[PDB]
Design a protein around this ligand. Structure first.
Ligand SMILES: [Ca+2]
Ligand SMILES: [Zn+2]
Ligand SMILES: [Zn+2]
Length: 530
């Protein structure tokens, strides 16, 4: 039966982040969905040009926007890792989702924590308005689960390894979690024969060499006990969705008086895209499995009779590896110069600044935030800035370099995210106590993974360009009226759009997003405070 998505408050909010599910990838395969993604695109409110609008198009900044209504400039989550050169501990690199105050910690051996997140999540705001609210977050990555759930979440679980799903220190598995992990262990202990190709994947079945690796033809065959293989496959998304459905039923989410919320971070698409690039059989199979498993998941919830509303989006977009782009009509695609990577860049800048052999800058990839060493004198700091700017601006693969002061002086951006300037994008993931002294941006179609004889990941996101910012945002509730809205919107718009449905006020001055009307035609779901 036809029924407005705003007719009454939904009893359950289901928020799904598909890691690296770019609008490019989503759109390419849109015509082949038959399951859960067909349900959302054919019946839902469809924003195919959503934006993780900031420059720092990584997993942690992206997840911090989805259920906070807040850009990274406000969440404080400006990268997966940032330096705190004043940190007490020896490792000045901080992980986005750790508590570095813990003794004996490092960015390699950390204690998971939402402490770095400066704002509440939607579940936190629902819980402040009504303590009976349950707030649940499950993902294949701790940072996804943590940043979507927020500090007051009831249950936060993520895939921790071959042991299965785990939570914060001190949190023992419930009977449900042990059952889930027993099921997980049994699946892992069985070989997976892999997947024959869906029709749409047959055309993608050709090998591409990158350094010592060959990609393009994988079908997720894997040995028993091969956890790496399990992690980089549709298998972990199936597990995470099963875990979510069981949690929903076991906790009776959506079946009480108040509205509950569960966030789900489906990580496989990202591992797959990193390891193989995005246009081969591996991503193609993964996206088709995603559609199927989402369909099974929505069918279970429907069978349970739950009145739920869904939002599905991504934490960032993605970009294919250069070697395949060059085969497919993009011959200018290329990998970043090894000279721009951290060790080589620091050695170059230190030398030009008259300080050869010294540590003068800190960085953790060939783009993004660069920090001056705190042990520089003011004069030395000034030479280092001058030489860094001079050298990077003259490099043929560099688009531009912003100083901290230039970004700071930029007003928080407004207006259509699809036509922002680069510095507006930078401003949207600028947070003074955590951001670098310089922000390095590479030219379009330069992949920030240099060519090497021995390589790992062949492709990544993290650039300020459209492939990496643009993501779908899909909303759905049984019986609603579908519409398509192709103009740009931001993932920070998601929180106020859901809050309106449950009549939760959200002070406009505490968030960056705006309410999106999810009611096609005359009536307006946002009518009210938002
Ligand atoms: Ca309307
Ligand atoms: Zn991600
Ligand atoms: Zn990634």
């Amino acid at each position: 039966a036809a029924r407005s998505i705003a007719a009454t408050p939904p009893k359950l909010i289901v928020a799904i982040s598909v890691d690296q599910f770019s609008a490019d990838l989503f759109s390419e395969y849109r015509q082949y969905y038959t399951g859960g993604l067909k349900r959302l695109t054919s019946e839902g409110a469809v924003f195919p040009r959503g934006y993780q609008s900031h420059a720092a198009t990584e997993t942690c900044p992206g997840h911090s926007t989805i259920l906070t209504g807040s850009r990274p400039s406000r969440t404080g989550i400006i990268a997966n890792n940032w330096f705190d050169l004043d940190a007490k501990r020896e490792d000045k690199n901080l992980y986005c989702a750790e508590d570095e105050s813990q003794p004996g910690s490092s960015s390699d051996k950390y204690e998971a924590s939402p402490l770095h997140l400066k704002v509440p999540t939607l579940g936190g705001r629902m819980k402040a308005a009504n303590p009976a609210t349950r707030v649940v977050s499950v993902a294949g990555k701790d940072r996804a689960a943590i940043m979507m759930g927020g500090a007051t979440a009831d249950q936060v679980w993520w895939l921790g390894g071959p042991q299965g799903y785990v939570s914060y220190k001190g949190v023992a598995p419930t009977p449900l979690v042990t059952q889930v992990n027993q099921a997980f262990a049994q699946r892992l202990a069985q070989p997976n024969p892999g997947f024959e190709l869906p029709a749409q994947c047959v055309s993608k079945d050709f090998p591409v060499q990158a350094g010592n690796r060959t990609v393009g033809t994988g079908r997720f065959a894997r040995d028993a006990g091969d956890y790496k293989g399990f992690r980089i496959s549709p298998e972990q998304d199936a597990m995470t969705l099963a875990f979510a459905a069981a949690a929903i039923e076991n906790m009776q989410l959506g079946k009480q008086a108040q509205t509950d919320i569960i966030s789900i971070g489906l990580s496989a698409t990202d591992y797959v895209g990193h390891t193989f690039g995005t246009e081969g059989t591996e991503s193609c199979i993964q996206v088709d499995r995603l559609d199927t498993e989402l369909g099974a998941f929505f069918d279970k919830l429907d069978k349970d009779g739950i009145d739920y509303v869904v939002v599905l989006t991504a934490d960032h977009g993605g970009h294919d590896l250069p070697e395949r782009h060059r085969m497919n009509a993009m011959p200018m695609e290329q990998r970043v110069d090894m000279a721009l990577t951290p060790k080589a860049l620091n050695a170059t800048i230190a030398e030009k600044a008259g300080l050869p052999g010294k540590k003068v800058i800190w960085s953790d990839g060939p783009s993004g935030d660069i920090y001056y060493d705190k042990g520089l004198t003011a004069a030395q700091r000034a030479r280092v800035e001058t030489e860094a700017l001079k050298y990077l601006r003259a490099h043929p693969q560099v688009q531009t370099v912003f100083t901290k002061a230039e970004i700071a002086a930029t007003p928080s951006p407004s207006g259509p995210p699809e036509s922002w300037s680069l510095i507006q994008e930078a401003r949207a993931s600028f947070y003074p106590s955590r951001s670098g002294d310089l922000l390095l941006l590479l030219k379009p179609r330069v992949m920030s993974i240099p060519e090497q004889a021995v390589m790992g990941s062949v492709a990544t996101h993290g650039s300020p360009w459209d492939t990496d910012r643009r993501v779908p945002i899909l909303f759905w509730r049984k019986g609603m009226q579908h519409f398509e809205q192709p103009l740009g919107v931001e993932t920070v718009d998601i929180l106020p759009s859901l809050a309106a449905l449950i009549k939760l006020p959200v002070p406009k001055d505490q968030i960056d997003g705006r309410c999106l009307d999810l009611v096609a035609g005359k009536d307006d779901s946002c009518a009210g405070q938002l």
